[PDB]
Amino acid sequence: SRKTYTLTDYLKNTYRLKLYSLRWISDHEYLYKQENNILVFNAEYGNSSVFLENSTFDEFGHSINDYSISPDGQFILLEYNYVKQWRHSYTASYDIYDLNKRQLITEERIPNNTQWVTWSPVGHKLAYVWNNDIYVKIEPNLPSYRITWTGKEDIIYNGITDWVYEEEVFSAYSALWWSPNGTFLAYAQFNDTEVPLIEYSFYSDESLQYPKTVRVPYPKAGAVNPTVKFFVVNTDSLSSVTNATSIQITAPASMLIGDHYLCDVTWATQERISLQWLRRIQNYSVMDICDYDESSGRWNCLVARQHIEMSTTGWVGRFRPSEPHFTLDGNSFYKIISNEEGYRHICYFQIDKKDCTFITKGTWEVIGIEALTSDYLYYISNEYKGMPGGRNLYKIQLSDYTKVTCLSCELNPERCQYYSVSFSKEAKYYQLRCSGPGLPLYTLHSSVNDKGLRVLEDNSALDKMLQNVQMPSKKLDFIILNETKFWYQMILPPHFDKSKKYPLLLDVYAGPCSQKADTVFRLNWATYLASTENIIVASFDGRGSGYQGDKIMHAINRRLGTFEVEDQIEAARQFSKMGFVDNKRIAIWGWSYGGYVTSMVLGSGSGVFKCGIAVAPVSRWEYYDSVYTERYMGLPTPEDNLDHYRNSTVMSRAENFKQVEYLLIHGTADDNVHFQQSAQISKALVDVGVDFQAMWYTDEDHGIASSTAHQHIYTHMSHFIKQCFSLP
Amino acid sequence: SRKTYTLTDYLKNTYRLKLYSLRWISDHEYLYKQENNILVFNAEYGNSSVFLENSTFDEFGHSINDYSISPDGQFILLEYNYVKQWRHSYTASYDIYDLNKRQLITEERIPNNTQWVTWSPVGHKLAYVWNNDIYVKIEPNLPSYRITWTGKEDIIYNGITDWVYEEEVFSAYSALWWSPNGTFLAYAQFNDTEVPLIEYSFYSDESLQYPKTVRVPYPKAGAVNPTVKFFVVNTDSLSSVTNATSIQITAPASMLIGDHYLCDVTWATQERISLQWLRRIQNYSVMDICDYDESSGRWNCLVARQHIEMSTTGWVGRFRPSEPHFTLDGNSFYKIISNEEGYRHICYFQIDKKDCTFITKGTWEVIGIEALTSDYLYYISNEYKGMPGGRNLYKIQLSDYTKVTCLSCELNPERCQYYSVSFSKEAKYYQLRCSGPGLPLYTLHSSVNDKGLRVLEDNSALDKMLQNVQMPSKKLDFIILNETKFWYQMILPPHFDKSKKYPLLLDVYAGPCSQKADTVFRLNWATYLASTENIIVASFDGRGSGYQGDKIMHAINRRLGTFEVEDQIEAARQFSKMGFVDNKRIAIWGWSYGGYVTSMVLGSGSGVFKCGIAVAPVSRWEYYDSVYTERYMGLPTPEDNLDHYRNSTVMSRAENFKQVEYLLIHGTADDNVHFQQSAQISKALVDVGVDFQAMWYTDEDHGIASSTAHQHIYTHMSHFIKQCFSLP
Ligand SMILES: *C(=N)[C@@H]1C[C@@H]2C[C@@H]2N1C(=O)[C@@H](N)[C@@]12C[C@@H]3C[C@@H](C[C@@](O)(C3)C1)C2
């Protein structure tokens, strides 16, 4: 009688997860948006006040896309006219609303087409980027000071990232770092003068008669990379009539002998900055610690204070060197480092000392350091019950490292095994956020004795509705391959019956440091395939996958498209043995790296798979960007790793594709994984006479995520899998 | 027979038609290559000898792509390093070989990357184009004289066409015309400075890291057109010291007032040139007659012998103003003109007098004038038996117009109903070429008494092979719609049984002045579809179609995408009535204009069609080029015909596509119908929520004709059609 979870339910979002997104603004209060009202909440007592009425700006004249309140509460930035660029970057217009008064400030407005804007950490200074140059406003109504004059579209970027830094290094458009004081503005400058341009057509609305050509500086593997410089300006000594002076901070000589990246920026105190640099060959990095000389007005970085991080087994950090967390006085810090057994744990460094001290150890990894006080360090790890796909909050007593208390493991052990967290300033309180395996649960806690204060959102509304649907369930378990555990999950049809044989869809990603088997609750395409189409959707984390130490993660070093492709295959065989999978109906699919792996598997001739779907696949590593690819594959030269570059293409395997049904899909405006990668696959298949199915999506990018395209691609894919599985 | 004509037979050319391609080199001799030997034949007596032995260039080194023998038989042009550009244009390398000395020329060679070369009509002068400039060689071993200095890639073309002139106007890359003497070289010059560029990606071999962007000056409907100038140079007065003096001949003043085209160049005598010009609104055309003033070195085009052609119902000519055929003295000419009743017939013009005299008349049309002698004019027409899809050779006695003799009608009336012809110099002999309904037949004849001399090729070898195969038959007939007859053909499966019900594939082109129902014999995809899959393949010639008078051809004027579309739908209903059609299984497909009509049809919500395939469709007329589109559609301005431009798009019909299965195919490097057109179709279907199948072919142009792609697309379409018809 009860309904199933339908494709339409997925597509139209019938069943919504409620969130509780808060922003701490002090040690005891947070802001929360509620029915477009902005409320301030007091953590200890839970009482609230309306800070911004949803009726304010009703007559503002534009739909306001976003807001940002200055730290000390005197102003609010209103973002409107948002126009998205890449994954993080975008352009917009801005108004400032004086809260003390009740006026929009009318003159010296932040310009249209501004590329980035930030408040300082304290007060109400602004820094923004417009036409690739940096500007500073001391007060919201005063004329800004121009800090840089070198900005040039597509060539010199001040205070914002170029394409490859945004996507691969900072995961952000911003390249601006205020000191905790607001006294100094640090920024990077990127120079793309000789980076080659990827070009592709954008077709736009039907009314455009000639297609547009988009051209983006974009280093493919082995190509010329952007260069970077780092500067710090004193925002307290700006002059109306004198250009502002930026002091440059140069990379360490061991970086200057070749191509290198600036990869981390972190203020330690009001007068100390930490910079991390990374060689183009990403197995060697340097942390520089630079102090302000108030007499010189200059910045010096003592070589004695440098810290070096090397890898023998692979690359530095999971995707990049980890962030250091400085003690209050700035003379020491903690960061995650891979230990001698290859597990990532918390290491304590002292700035004038050479080696660090491990504060944690064991056959599990620290995921992130979340907070630090003088008595305790709080971190997320997957230690609980030895499950790599679980996540919990722990605290370590800094006076006795043997005293670790888990703060989340036992709160709600059946419902909650995957936590993330958000601490107020000075770590007086924290919000816990459980993501599964039960429905997401948001709770507020006091750090004093780690006492629960109250439930913030328990998603009871969603619970009511789902009691009316036949939901699939999820199994998280492991198999053994050559003496080692590798984890998988299965999304199982409702009323699962291990005596019947089900079709199986292998959902893959398997890029380096990926994890597809975990304890989080999701409502997605797979929910539909299991609930309505009675398909099992499996995912497997093989060699190359993360959060289980370097032996596993680095197995793939200089060898992309090998072990992680074989392992997805062997996992599929082992699934086939289990007595509830029809071995005649095994499919595979994935997006991006998942599309690469899907294609390499389908072209392996294993005979294990009936059909597969690759969406926006990499096909050849020379086509993808330098920073991501070289991190794992080194350089595509005869002296380095050219030979596995050439050995790991989808194209070289065209012939074996005649054994399977293949659907190939790609967006024509994909700035990230270029349509090119897919166009070379289809051409190789044609050359060898293999029939297959294709679908391009006009003007969609890597995400294929406009509402209509998103509905369309999943509708198309369902049909393909239904037909491949002889489902009616 | 047991065996059928298979997809593989089509794809791999199991059964080849033999041809007999000769070139006349005088009034009674022709060259014909047998094996790789070049033979010279004597037409009167049929005897022959080897002109050039196949073993002459074994040591030449390069693969010779083609050859051209000079008129006086002394030299031969060898063409290698052939590189195709658009439909007619290409670059190549050239060697010249002295036939008397029996040695290759080594001094003053024709440059690499030459764009066009042509002997003078007499003797052995050479004119060629290189880097967009014209050069002339008096002797094959002497330095060439440079004629123009203005050539610049993609901007100034001397002696060759730009894109839209090659494709839509001259159907040729060449824009050079030797006078009959070889004394004068006339050439056109095209100026693309302000013509917008169409841009698209070319991906090339896998090894190319960054896709290349192709850029071509291409006027879309309504955009700035290239401009043209016309020049004549005296080749007998060239100096190695002084520059070549090119005399310009300017368009008439009635053309100069706005945008216009040079549409035809014809030498009449040694000192008389004919130029036809065409207004950009292509219902107005002017023919100039220009004479050399020997005493001034100038060319004068007097208005006394200027002729005007206008249309009130449509455009001028079938695709352009027809060619003039001058009598020997240059004082008069014959050309095809639409008469008072809208049928195209031969008209007699006397240079300095008004009007012309029609010398043919009737309900039918002359397809072309083929040859002109002192006594007779030879032309092809579809008079015979009132079949508009047949072609026959006639001659009209010049001294008495009522004396018309059909020369081909009765040669073999059951095998042969579609002839073309090739006359020798001065029309002493002609080769007849019959293309259907039976197997092709080549014969030689003499003009004196129209005696049949001998058979050249009768395709007996093909004949015996096909006797062993179950071949389809071809039905050619008409339905009456109003009081008008409209012709159609059916390719019928072997052992056709009118009591059975067969699935039907409507094969459409249906562009202006097209004809898809004729008596030609073809071995193509439809053959496979009828012979092996027992599918009926029908084509219908409705309103807009040619060779049946203006009333029918012009019906579509300024309204593309209406009657020709409706009529295809109406034909299928008629076909449905006929009791041998399963009206639950009717499909449609077409390429280019057929792709556009197919989609308009599928988007009409008519319910007659289950599925259809569009290959490289036009989707919106603003996307296609100015010369073709504007010819039928006028300009897309509010004051002209913008409303129907906007009413006749495929995109506006997307909603109705949810009623049919649709396959959309396009090549990414299509320089003619830009991929843009299908890119916008799929986008409209996505935005509307309609599922469909698609396939791009990377780096393929409009013909998708690389042998791997050609095999692939037809294999893909075959699978699609067989599933739509449930044909196991
Ligand atoms: C697929 N998403 C492409 C192709 C391979 C994985 C490279 N990839 C990326 O887009 C990367 N830039 C990602 C995006 C995101 C954050 C980082 C890790 C990642 O696994 C997920 C890949 C960099």
Ligand SMILES: *C(=N)[C@@H]1C[C@@H]2C[C@@H]2N1C(=O)[C@@H](N)[C@@]12C[C@@H]3C[C@@H](C[C@@](O)(C3)C1)C2
């Ligand atoms: C597809 N055939 C495209 C799109 C519309 C029909 C116009 N077309 C052409 O390619 C034209 N340039 C043609 C090519 C060839 C010779 C001329 C008449 C034509 O019907 C066949 C179309 C111009």
